[PDB]
Structures are given as structure tokens and as C-alpha cells.
PDB file of C-alpha atoms in Angstrom:
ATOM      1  CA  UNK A   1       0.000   0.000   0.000  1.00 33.12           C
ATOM      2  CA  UNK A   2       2.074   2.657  -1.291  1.00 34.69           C
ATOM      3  CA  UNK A   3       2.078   5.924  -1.321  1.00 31.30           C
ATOM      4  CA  UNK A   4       3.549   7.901  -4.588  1.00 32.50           C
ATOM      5  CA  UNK A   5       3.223  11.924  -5.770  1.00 33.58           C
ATOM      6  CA  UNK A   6       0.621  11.780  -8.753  1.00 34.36           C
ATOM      7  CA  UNK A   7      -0.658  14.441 -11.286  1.00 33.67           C
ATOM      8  CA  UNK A   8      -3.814  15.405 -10.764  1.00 34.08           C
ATOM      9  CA  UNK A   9      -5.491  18.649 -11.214  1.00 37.82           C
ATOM     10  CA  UNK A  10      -1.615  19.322  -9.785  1.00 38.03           C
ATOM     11  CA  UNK A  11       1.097  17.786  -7.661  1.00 38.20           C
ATOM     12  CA  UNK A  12      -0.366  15.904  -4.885  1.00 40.37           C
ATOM     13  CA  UNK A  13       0.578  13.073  -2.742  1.00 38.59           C
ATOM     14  CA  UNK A  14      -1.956   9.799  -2.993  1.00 39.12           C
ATOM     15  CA  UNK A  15      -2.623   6.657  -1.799  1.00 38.74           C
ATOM     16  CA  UNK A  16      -2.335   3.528  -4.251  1.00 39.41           C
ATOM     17  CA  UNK A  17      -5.954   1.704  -4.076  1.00 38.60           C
ATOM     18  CA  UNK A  18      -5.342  -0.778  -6.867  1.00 34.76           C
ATOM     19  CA  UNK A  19      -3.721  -3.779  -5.595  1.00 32.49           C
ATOM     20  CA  UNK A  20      -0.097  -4.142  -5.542  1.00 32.21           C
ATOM     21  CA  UNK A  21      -0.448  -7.572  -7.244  1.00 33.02           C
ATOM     22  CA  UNK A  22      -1.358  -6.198 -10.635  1.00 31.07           C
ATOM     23  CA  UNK A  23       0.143  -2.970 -10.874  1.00 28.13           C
ATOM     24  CA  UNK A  24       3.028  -3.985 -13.101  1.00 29.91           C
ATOM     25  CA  UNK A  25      -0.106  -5.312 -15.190  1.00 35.75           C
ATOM     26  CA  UNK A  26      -1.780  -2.471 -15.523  1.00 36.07           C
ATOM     27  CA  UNK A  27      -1.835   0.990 -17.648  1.00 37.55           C
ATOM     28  CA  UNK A  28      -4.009   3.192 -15.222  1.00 37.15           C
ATOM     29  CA  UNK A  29      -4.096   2.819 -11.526  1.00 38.02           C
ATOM     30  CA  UNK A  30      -6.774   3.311  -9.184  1.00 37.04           C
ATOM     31  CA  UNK A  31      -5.615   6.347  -6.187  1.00 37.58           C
ATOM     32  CA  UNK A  32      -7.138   8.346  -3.491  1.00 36.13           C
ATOM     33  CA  UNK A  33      -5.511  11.439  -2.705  1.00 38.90           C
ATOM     34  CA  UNK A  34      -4.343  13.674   0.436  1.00 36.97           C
ATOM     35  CA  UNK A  35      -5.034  16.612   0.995  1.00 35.53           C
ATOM     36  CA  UNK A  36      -3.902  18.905   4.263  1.00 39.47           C
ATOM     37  CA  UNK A  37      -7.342  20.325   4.626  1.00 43.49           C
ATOM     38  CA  UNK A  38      -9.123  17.732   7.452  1.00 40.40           C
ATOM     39  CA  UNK A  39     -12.996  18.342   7.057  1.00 42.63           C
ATOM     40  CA  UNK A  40     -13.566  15.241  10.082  1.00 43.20           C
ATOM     41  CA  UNK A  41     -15.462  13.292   7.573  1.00 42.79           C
ATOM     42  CA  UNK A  42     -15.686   9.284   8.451  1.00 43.30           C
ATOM     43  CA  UNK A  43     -14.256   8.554   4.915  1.00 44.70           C
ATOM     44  CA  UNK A  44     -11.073  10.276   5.623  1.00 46.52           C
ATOM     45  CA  UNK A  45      -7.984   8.189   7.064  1.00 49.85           C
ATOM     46  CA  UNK A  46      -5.080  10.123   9.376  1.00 51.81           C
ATOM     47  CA  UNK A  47      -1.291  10.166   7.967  1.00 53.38           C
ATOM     48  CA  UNK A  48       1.198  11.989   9.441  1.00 54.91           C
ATOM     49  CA  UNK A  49       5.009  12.709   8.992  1.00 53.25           C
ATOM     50  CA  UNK A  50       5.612   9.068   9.951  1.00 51.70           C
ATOM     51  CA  UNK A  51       3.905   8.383   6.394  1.00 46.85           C
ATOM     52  CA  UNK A  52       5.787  10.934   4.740  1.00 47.00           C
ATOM     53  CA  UNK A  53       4.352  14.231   4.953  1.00 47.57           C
ATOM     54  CA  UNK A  54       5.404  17.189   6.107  1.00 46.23           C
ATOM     55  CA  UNK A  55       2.191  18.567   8.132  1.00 47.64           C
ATOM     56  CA  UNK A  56      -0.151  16.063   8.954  1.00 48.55           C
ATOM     57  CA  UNK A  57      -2.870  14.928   6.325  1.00 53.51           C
ATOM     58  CA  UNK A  58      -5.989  12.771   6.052  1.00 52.91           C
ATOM     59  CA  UNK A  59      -6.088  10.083   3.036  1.00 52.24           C
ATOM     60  CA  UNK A  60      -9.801  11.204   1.156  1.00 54.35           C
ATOM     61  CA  UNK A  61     -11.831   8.135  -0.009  1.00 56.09           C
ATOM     62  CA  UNK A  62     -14.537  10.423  -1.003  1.00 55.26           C
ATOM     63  CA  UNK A  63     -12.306  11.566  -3.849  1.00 52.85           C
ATOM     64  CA  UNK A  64     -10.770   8.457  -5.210  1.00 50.63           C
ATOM     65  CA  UNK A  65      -9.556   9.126  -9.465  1.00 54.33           C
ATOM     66  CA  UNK A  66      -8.174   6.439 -11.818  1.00 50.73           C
ATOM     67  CA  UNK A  67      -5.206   8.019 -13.563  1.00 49.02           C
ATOM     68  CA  UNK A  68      -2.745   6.702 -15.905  1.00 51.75           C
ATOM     69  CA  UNK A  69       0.704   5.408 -15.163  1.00 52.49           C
ATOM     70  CA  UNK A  70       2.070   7.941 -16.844  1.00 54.51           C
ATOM     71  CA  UNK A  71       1.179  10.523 -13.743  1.00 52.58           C
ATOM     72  CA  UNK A  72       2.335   8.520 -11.385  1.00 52.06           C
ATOM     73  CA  UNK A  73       5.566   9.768  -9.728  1.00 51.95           C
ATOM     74  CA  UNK A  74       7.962   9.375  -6.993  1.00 52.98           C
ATOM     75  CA  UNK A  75       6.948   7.001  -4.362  1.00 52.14           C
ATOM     76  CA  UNK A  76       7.478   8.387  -1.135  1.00 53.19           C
ATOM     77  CA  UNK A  77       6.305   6.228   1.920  1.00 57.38           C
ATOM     78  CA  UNK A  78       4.239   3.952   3.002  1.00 57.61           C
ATOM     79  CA  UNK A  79       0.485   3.464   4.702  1.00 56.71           C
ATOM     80  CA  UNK A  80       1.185   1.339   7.742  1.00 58.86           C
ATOM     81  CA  UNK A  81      -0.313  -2.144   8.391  1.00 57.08           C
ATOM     82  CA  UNK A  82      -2.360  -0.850  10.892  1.00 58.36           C
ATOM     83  CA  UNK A  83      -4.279   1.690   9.526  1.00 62.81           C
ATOM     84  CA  UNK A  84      -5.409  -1.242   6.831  1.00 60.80           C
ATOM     85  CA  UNK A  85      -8.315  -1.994   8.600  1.00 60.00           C
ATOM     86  CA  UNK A  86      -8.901   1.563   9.177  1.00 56.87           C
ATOM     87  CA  UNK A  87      -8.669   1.649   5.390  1.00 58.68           C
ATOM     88  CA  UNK A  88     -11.305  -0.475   4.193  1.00 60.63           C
ATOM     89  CA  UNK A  89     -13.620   0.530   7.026  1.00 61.20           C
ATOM     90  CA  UNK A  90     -13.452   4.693   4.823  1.00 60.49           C
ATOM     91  CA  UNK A  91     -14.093   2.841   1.797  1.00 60.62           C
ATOM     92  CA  UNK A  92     -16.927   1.151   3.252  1.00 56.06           C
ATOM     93  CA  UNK A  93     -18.957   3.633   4.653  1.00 59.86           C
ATOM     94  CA  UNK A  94     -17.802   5.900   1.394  1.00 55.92           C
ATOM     95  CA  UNK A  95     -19.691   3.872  -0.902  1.00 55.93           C
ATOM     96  CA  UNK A  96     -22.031   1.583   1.521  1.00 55.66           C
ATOM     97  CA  UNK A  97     -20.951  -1.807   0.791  1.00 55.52           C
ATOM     98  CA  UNK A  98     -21.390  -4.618   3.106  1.00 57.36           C
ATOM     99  CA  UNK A  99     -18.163  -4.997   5.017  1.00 51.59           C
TER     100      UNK A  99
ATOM    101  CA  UNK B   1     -27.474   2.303  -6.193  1.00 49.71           C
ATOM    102  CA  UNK B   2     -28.556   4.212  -9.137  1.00 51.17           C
ATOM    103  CA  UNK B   3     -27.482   4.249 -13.108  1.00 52.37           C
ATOM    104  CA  UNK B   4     -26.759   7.712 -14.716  1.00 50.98           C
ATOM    105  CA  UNK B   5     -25.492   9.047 -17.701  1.00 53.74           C
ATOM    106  CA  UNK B   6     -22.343  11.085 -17.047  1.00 50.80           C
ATOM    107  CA  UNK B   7     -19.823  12.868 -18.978  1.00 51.40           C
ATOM    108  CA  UNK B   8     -16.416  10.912 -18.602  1.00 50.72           C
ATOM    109  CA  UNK B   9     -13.930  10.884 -22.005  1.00 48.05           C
ATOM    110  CA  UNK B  10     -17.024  10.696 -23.582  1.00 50.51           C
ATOM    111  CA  UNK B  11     -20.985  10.160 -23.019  1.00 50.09           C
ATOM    112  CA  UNK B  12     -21.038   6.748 -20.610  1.00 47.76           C
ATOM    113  CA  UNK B  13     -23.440   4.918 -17.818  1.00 49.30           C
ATOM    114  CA  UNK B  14     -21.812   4.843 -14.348  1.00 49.46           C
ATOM    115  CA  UNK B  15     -22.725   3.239 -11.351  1.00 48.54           C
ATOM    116  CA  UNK B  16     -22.876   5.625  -8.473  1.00 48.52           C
ATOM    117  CA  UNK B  17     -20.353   3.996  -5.678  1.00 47.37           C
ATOM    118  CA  UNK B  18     -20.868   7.246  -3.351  1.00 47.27           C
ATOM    119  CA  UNK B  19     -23.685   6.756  -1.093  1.00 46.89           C
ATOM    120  CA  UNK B  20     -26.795   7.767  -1.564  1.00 48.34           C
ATOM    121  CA  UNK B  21     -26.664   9.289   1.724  1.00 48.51           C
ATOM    122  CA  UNK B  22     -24.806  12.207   1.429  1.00 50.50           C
ATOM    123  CA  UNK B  23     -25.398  13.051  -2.229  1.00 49.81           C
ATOM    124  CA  UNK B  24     -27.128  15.918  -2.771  1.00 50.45           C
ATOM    125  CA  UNK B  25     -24.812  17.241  -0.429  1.00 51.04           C
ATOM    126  CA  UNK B  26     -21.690  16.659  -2.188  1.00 51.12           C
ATOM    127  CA  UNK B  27     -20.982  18.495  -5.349  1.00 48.79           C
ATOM    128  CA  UNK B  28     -18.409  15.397  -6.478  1.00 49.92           C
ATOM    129  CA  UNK B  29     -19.579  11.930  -6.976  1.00 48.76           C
ATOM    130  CA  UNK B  30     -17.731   8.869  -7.249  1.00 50.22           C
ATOM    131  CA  UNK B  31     -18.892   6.834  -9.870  1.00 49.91           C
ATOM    132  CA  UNK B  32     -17.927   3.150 -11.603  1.00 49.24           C
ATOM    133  CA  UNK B  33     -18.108   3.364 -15.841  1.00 49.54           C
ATOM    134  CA  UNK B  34     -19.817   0.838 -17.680  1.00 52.02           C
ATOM    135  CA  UNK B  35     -18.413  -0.725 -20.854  1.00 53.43           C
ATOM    136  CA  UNK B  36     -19.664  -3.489 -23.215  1.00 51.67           C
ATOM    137  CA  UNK B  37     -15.417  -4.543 -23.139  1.00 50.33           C
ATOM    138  CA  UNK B  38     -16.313  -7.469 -21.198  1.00 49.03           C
ATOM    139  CA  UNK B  39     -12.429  -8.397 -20.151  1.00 46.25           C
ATOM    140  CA  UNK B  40     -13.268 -11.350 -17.410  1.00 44.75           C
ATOM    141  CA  UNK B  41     -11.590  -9.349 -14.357  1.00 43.68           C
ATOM    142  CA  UNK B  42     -13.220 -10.639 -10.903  1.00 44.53           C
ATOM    143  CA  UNK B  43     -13.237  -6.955 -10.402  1.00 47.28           C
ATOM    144  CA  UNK B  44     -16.500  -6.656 -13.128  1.00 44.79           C
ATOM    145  CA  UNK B  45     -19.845  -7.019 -12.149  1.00 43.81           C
ATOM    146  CA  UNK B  46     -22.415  -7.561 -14.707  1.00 44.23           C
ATOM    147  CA  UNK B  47     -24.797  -5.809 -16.351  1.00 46.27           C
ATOM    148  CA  UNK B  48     -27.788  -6.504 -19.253  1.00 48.84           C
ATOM    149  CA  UNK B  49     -30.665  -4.891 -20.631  1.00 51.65           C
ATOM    150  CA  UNK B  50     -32.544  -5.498 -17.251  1.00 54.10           C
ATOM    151  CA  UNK B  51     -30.482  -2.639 -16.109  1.00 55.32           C
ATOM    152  CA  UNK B  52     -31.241  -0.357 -18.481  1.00 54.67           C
ATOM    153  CA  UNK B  53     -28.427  -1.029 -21.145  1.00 54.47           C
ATOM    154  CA  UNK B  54     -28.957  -2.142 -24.644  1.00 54.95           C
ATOM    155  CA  UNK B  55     -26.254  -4.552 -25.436  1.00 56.33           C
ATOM    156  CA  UNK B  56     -25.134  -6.771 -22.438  1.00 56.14           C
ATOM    157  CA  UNK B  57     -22.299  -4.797 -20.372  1.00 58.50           C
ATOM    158  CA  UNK B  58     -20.142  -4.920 -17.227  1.00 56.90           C
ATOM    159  CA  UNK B  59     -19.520  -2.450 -14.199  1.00 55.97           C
ATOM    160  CA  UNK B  60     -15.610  -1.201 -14.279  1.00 60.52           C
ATOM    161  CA  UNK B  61     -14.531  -1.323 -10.663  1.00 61.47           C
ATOM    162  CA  UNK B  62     -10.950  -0.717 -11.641  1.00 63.37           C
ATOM    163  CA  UNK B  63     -11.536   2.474 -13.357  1.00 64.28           C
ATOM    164  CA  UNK B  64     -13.746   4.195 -10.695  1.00 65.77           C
ATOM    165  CA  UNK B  65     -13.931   8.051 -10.833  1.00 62.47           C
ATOM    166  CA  UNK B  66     -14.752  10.835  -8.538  1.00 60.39           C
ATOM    167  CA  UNK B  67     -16.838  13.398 -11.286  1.00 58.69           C
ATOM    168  CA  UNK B  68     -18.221  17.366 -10.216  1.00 57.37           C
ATOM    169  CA  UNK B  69     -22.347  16.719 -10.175  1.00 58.43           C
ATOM    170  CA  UNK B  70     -21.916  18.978 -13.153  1.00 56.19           C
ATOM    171  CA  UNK B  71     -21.120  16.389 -15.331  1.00 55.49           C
ATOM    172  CA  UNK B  72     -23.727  14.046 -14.112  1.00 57.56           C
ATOM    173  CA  UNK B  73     -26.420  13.313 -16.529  1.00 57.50           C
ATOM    174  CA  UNK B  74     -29.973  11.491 -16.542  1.00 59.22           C
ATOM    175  CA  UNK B  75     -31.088   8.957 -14.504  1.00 58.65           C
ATOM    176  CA  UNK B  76     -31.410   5.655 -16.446  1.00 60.75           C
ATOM    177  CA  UNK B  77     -31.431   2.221 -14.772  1.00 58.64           C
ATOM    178  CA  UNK B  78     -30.762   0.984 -11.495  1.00 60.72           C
ATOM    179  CA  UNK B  79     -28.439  -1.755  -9.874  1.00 60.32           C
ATOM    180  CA  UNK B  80     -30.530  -4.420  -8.336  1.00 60.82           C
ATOM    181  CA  UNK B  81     -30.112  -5.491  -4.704  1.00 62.07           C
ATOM    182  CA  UNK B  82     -29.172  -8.724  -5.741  1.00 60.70           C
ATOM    183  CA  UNK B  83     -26.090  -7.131  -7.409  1.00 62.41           C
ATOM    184  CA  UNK B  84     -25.191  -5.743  -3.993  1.00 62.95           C
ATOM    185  CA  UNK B  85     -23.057  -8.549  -2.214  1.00 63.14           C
ATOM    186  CA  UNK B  86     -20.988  -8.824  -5.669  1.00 61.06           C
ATOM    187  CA  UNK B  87     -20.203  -5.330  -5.958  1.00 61.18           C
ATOM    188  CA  UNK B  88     -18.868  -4.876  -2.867  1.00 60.48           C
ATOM    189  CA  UNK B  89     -16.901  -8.208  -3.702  1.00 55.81           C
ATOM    190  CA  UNK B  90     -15.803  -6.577  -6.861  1.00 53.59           C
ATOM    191  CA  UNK B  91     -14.609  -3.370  -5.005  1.00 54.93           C
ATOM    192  CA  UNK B  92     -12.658  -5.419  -2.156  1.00 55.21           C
ATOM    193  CA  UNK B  93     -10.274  -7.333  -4.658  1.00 57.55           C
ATOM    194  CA  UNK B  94      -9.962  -4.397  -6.449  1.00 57.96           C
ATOM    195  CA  UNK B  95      -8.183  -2.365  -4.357  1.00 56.01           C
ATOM    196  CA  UNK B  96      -7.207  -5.602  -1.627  1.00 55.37           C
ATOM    197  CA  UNK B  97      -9.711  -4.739   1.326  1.00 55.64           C
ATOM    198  CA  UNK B  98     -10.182  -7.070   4.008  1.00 55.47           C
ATOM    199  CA  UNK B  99     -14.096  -7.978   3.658  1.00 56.56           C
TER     200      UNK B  99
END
């Protein structure tokens, strides 16, 4: 669960969604970026400079984009194991599926 | 779990993944496109006439997209509850979530 700098509407840092085991497979990848701004939403998961930041920063499952490869940048830290479960518990509740 | 039309690349049905919920007070939505490319990923769920489609067609979990309201279009279909269980399932190998 990586995370990488990406090109969106600009520079941002994001979290990789699509599954390790077929990114090498894959032309576009699925991310959800992080922004500064905390708005104490349930779909929003803490990182802090542990991750890789500089201030600290929620990961925003409300605003997950599939973007090519070829905006994908330097990878620059890592979500911990424990905030996995914290992790699909946002995307949950983001979308309502059955967890 | 409604069907629009939204403005993508191009003119395409989407599956709303936000939740109902909270949408008319969000002015993003994150949305799943729906293709007739029927590629046999587990990460596809399908989709027919039933839904509101004319040709037989699949629900793209790997290219999910969070799209301004702006570009959301008309209502046409819906995404039965029996679909439910295997969209989440499509959504929790797609990105790895433990389920």
C-alpha cells in the first residue's frame, strides 16, 4: 500500500488503491488522494510525517480518481499495516458496501 | 445504487459507488463506468438490458472516478439489490480490502 506523488489537477501526494499484485499489469491505476485540509469526515484516514508528509494529512476516499501510469511519480512512503483496517472501514462507509 | 449518464472521455453509464446518503450534499460523486469490453476481471460485475443497457455490459470497478455533479447526466437504470453482495466483492479485490 504505497504511497507515490501523482498528477492530478496538480502535484499531490496519494494513496495507491489498486492492488499491488497487478500494478506492473496495468496501464491506469486506481488512487485516493491527500489533501492537508481535514474536514472530520468518516471517509477520511489520518497520515502523518511518519507516512511521509510534512504537516499532517488525512487520506480522502470520497475523492478516489483512476489516472494513468504515466502521472504517477515518486513514491514516497508507506500506509502502515495498521491503519489497513482503518482503510477499508473509509471505503466502506464511502460507498455503503457490506463490510 | 442508481445508473446515470455522465460525462467521462465521452458520453457513458456509471454506477454511483458514493452513497446515496450524502449526495445531494456533495458536489463530487464517485462513480464506476460501464463498458460493453467485457475483459473477465473478478473486479467486473455484470450488467444486461434489465439494467437499463442495450447490449449486455459490465460495471468497471478498476476504473472508478470521482466526477463534479456537473457532469452528471440522466437517470437511467438501477443496480438491483441482488447485485449488492458482488459489488462490494468486486470493489474489495480491487483495491485488496479485508471484507
Amino acid at each position: 500500500r504505497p504511497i507515490h506523488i501523482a498528477q492530478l489537477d496538480k502535484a499531490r501526494p496519494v494513496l495507491i488503491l489498486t492492488r499491488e499484485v497487478v500494478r506492473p499489469h496495468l496501464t491506469n491505476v486506481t488512487v485516493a488522494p491527500i489533501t492537508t485540509t481535514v474536514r472530520g469526515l468518516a471517509t477520511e484516514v489520518p497520515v502523518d510525517a511518519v507516512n511521509g508528509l510534512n504537516q499532517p494529512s488525512v487520506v480522502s476516499c470520497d475523492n478516489t480518481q483512476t489516472i494513468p501510469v504515466c502521472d504517477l511519480g515518486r513514491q514516497i512512503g508507506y500506509l502502515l499495516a495498521s491503519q489497513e483496517p482503518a482503510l477499508a472501514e473509509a471505503i466502506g462507509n464511502a460507498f455503503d458496501l457490506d463490510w
